[model samples]
Target: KIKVANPVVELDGDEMTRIIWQFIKDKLIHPYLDLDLEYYDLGVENRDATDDQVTIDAANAIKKHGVGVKCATITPDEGRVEEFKLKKMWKSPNGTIRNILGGVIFREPIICKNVPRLVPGWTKPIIVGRHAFGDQYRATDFKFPGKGKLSIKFVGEDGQTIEHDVYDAPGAGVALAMYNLDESITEFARASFNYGLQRKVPVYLSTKNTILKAYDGRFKDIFQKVFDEEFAAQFKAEKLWYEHRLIDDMVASALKWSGGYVWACKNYDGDVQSDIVAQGFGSLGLMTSVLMTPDGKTVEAEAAHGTVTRHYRQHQKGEETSTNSIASIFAWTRGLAHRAKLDGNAELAKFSETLERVCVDTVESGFMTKDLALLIGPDQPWLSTTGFLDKIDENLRKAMA
Candidate 1:
C-alpha cells in the first residue's frame, strides 16, 4: 500500500453523493493506500443535531490539516427546512466554510475524451475563480417609503469622512449600498493568481468596470496591482499571463474561444457564468470545485454541483437509479491529490493520478451513468449508480495492479 504520512480531512454530506462518497472511501481509497482520514459528518441531520457546529469543526479541521475533501451538501431553504424539521435555517455550509477558510473557489469541469461538450471547441477546462465574499451578497438593501433622497456615507476612525448622494428618487423604490474592501479584493486576486500558477493556466479577470466604474473598476485595478506586484515575474517565468476584460466581452470570448484558462469573476458574475460554463462543458456531474487560499497552502476540494436529491428520492423508494457519481468521486481524488502534493509523497501522487485516469478512461470506454449517458444520446447505455462505482473500483484495482 502507498503510505500517506498526513491525514486528509473528509467532510461527509447529504443524500446520493454521500452514499457515493462512502463507496469511494471504501473501494477507491482504503484498498490502495495506508492513509489517515480525518472524518467529520456534515450531513443534514448531523449538522442540525450538532447545531451546525459540525460544519464549523470540519472547516477548522481543514484549516489545520491543509487538505479537505467534502461531499455535496444540502443548503437548506424554506422547503428543505420544513422537510428536515430543522430548528433554524442554517447558513450555507459552503459559505460558512468559505468564510472561515478565506479563499477563492475555482470550479473546473472534468473532461472525458468521448463526451461531447455543447461548445465542442472547449477541449480543455475553463476554470472559474469566483470571488466568494462581499459585493451584492453582503449589500444592505432597503425599500424607501417615498421619493426621499438616497446617499452613501463612510466615516474613518480619525474623524475623517466621505459621503456621496446616490440618487434623488422620483418614486418609492429600493436602494442598495454594496461595498467591497481592498483587503478582500486583494486576497481574491492573489488566490486567483496562485491557482492559475498551480494549474499552469493563464488568468483573466472579468468585470463591468466600464459601467460600474468605481465598483467593478476597483476589482480590475486590484487584480492588476496584485499581479504586477506579486505574481507577474512568476507568471512570466511560467509562460503564463494575466489580463482584465469587460464582462460582456469576456462572456462572448468565453463562448467562442477554446478552454484552458482561468477566468476570475466578481461575486454575482461568477454565480451566473459558472453555471453557463458548467452547462456548456456538458454535465455538472463532470465538474469539480477547489478552494485555494491566497498563499496556496490550504485547499478544499468538492463537487461543483449539489446533492442528487431526485435520485436519492428514487433510491428511498427502492427504485433503481442511474445517478452520476463522477463529481463526488472527483472530490476525493482532488483532495487526495492535494494531500499527496503537500506531503511530498510521490507514490501517493501517482495513486491519485491513476485513480483520476481510471475515472476518465471508464467514461471514455462507454461506462457512465444516466446524466452523461443522456448527454451522449438515446442509444448510449448507462449503468446504475453502484454499477458505475463498481466499474471504477474494478478499473482502479486493475490500474494499481
Candidate 2:
C-alpha cells in the first residue's frame, strides 16, 4: 500500500468542480494510495450554514497541516446569492484562505507540446505570483464626495505621533489610506525568492516605487533585505537573480519575453496581469495555482478557475458536458506532491509526477474536452468530460502498471 504519513486538509466545494473533486479522489487518488485526509466541507451551503467559519476552519487546518487541496466554489453574485440564499455574499474563499496562510499565490501554466498557443513562440513557462495580501484586498477604501485638507497620522503606543500632509484638496476628489505590515512584506519576499530559487529562474518584483516610494518602497526594501540576508548567496550560486522593475516597464517586458522567470506582482497588479496571462497562455483551464508559505514548508493547491456552473446546469439535464478537468486534477497532484516531500515518501512523489505527466500527455495525444478543441479548430475532435477523464484514468493505470 502507498502510504501518506502526513495528513492533508481537504476543502471540498460546490457544483461541477465539487463533482470533479470526488472523481479525482475516487478514481485517481484512493485507488493508488492510503492518504490521511482531514476533510472540511467548504461547499457554499456548508460555509453559509457555519456562518463562513467553515472557510476559516479549512484555512486554519491548512495552516496546521502542511498541505491542502481545495475545489473551486462559487464566489457569490446576486444570482448565486439568491440561489444559495446565503446570509451574506461571502468574500472569495481564496482571499479568506490567503489571509490565514499569509503567503504568495503562484500560478504556473501547464503546457502541452502538441497544443499550439496563440503566442506559439513562448516555449517556456512563466510563473506569476501575487503577494496575496495588503492593497485593496485588505483595505478601507470608499468614495469621498469632496476632499479637504488630508493629513495622515501614525500613532505609536509610546505616545509618539508621526504626521504628514497627504493632500490639501483645492477641488473635489477622492482619497483612501492603505497600509501593509512589515511582517507581511517580508514573508512575501521570502516566498517569491524561494519560488524562483526552486524553479531555477530569475525573479522580478514590479512596483511603482518611483511614485509611491514611501508606500511601494517598503516592498522593495523588504525584498532586497530578505534576498541579501537569506537568499542572495544561494541565488548567486544558482546563477539566478532577483530584481525589481517599474510596473509599466514590467508589463511591456512581460508581453515580449518568451517566459522562464517569476513575475512577483503587487496585490493589485497580480489581479490585473493574471487575467492576461490566462488568455495569453490559451485557457484558464490550463493554469495551475499553488499557495506556498514563506517557510517553504506548506503548500495549498487549487485550480485558478471557478466551479463549472455552466456545465453543472447541463449535467443536471442529463446532457453530456465537455468541461476541462486537468487543472482540478493538477490541484490534487500538486498538493500531494508537497505531502510526499514532507513524508519523505519517494513512491508518493513518483505517483504525483506520473499522474501530472499523464494529464498533459492525454491532452497532447489529442484526447481533450471541447474547450481545448474549440481553441484548436472545431473539427479537432473532443471528448465529453467523463470520456476525457476516463481516458486519463486508462493512461494513468497503464503507466502505473
Candidate 3:
C-alpha cells in the first residue's frame, strides 16, 4: 500500500458527480493506499442545510491542509433554486472558495491518443490560467435614462485625487466601470509564472492593451514587472520565457499554435477562451482545473465540467446513464499527485502517476464513456457510467501490481 504522510481534504459534491465520487473513493482509491481524507460535503442540500457554512468550512479546511480535491457541484440558477427548494440563491461555492484561497485557476485538457480533437494539431495541452478576481465580473454597470456627462473619481485618504472623464452619453445609454489592483495582478503573474515553471512551459499573457490603454495596459505592465523582478532568473534558468499578446492576435494564434504553453487571461478573456479550448479539445469531460496560490504552496483540483444534472434526471427515472467520469477521476489524481510532492512520498507519487496513465490508456484502448465514444464515431462502443470507471479501476489495480 502507498503511504500518504499528510492528510488530503476531499470536498464531496452534488448530483451525478457525487455518485461517481463515492465509487472512486471505494473501488479505486481506498483499495491501494492508506490515506487520511478530510471530508466535507458541499452538496447542494448540505450547503443549504448549513446555510452555506459548509462551503466556507470546506475552503478553510483546504487552506489548512494545502490540498483539496472537489467534485463538480450545482451552482443554482432560478430553475435549480426552485427544484432544490433553496433558502436563497447562494453564491457559487467555487467563487467563494477562490475568494478565500486567493489564487489563479488553471484549466488544462487531458489528451488521449485515440480521442480526436477538433483542432487536430493540438496534440499537447493548452493550459489557461484565468485571473478570477476584479474585472467585468465585479464591475458596476447602470442604465441612464437621459444623456449626461459621466466621470470616475478616486479620492485618497493621503490627500491625493485621481479623476477621469469616462464619456459624454448620446441620449439614453448604459455605462460600466471596472478596475483591477496592482497587488492582484502581481499575484496572478507570480502564480502563472510558477505554474509555467512547474509544468516546464512558457507563459503568455493576453490583453487588449492597445485599445483599453490604461485598464488593459496595466495587466501587461504588471506581468512584465513581476516577471522581470522576481521570476526572470528562475524562468531563465529553466530556459522558459514570458511574453504579452494582444487578445485578438492571441485568439488567432491559439487556434493555430499546437499546445504546451500557459496562456494567462484576464477575467473576461479567461471566461470565454476556456470554453473554446474545452470544445476544441473534444469534451469537457477530459478537462482538469487546478487552483494554485501565488506562493505555489496550496492547490485545489477539480473537474472543469459541472454536475451531470441531465444524467441525474435519467438516473432518477430508473434509467442507466453513460456519464463520463474521467475528469472527476483526474481531480483525485492531480490533487494526490500534489500531496505526494508536498510530502516527498515516492510511492504515493508513483501511485497517482500510474493511475493517471491507466486512465488515458483505458480510453485509448477502445473503452470510453458515451461523450468520448460519440466524439470518435457512432460505431465506437460506449460504456455505462460505472462500466468506464470499473475499467479504470481494473486497469489501475493491474498497473499498481
Which one wins on TM-score?
2
Give the range of the ten consecutive residues with the poorest summed lDDT in model 1.
287-296
Candidate 3 lDDT: 0.88
* Residue 203 Cα positional deviation in candidate 2, in Å, after optimal superposition: 1.2
lDDT of 2 at 319: 83
TM-score of model 1 vs. true structure = 0.93
TM-score of each: 0.93, 0.95, 0.93
Q: Which residue runs does candidate 2 get wrong by more than 4 Å?
A: 145-149, 168-174
Stretches of candidate 3 off by over 4 Å are 143-149, 170-173, 233-239
Candidate 3: how many backbone clashes?
A: 0
lDDT of 3 by residue, 73-97 (tens): 8888888899889988877788888
lDDT of 1 by residue, 1-401 (tens): 88899999999989988888887778778877898989999888999999989989999999999999998988889999999999988877887787788668888888887778889888778999988777777778989988879999999999899999989999999989888878889999988898899889999999889999988888988899999999999999999999899999999999988988999988788878888888888876787888886567888998757788898999889999887888888788888888988989898888878988999999999999988888888899999988998999999888988
RMSD of each: 2.0, 1.7, 2.0
- Please give, for residues 1-401, the per-residue lDDT of candidate 2 as tens digits: 68888898999988998888888888888888998899999888999898989889998888899999989888888888888788888888888888778778888788876666777656689889988777887776555556578777889999899999978787777777778889989989888888899989999999999999988999999989999999999999999999899999999888889989999998889878877787787887888888888677888998768788889999889888988899899999999899989988899999999999999998989999988998888579999988888999999989988
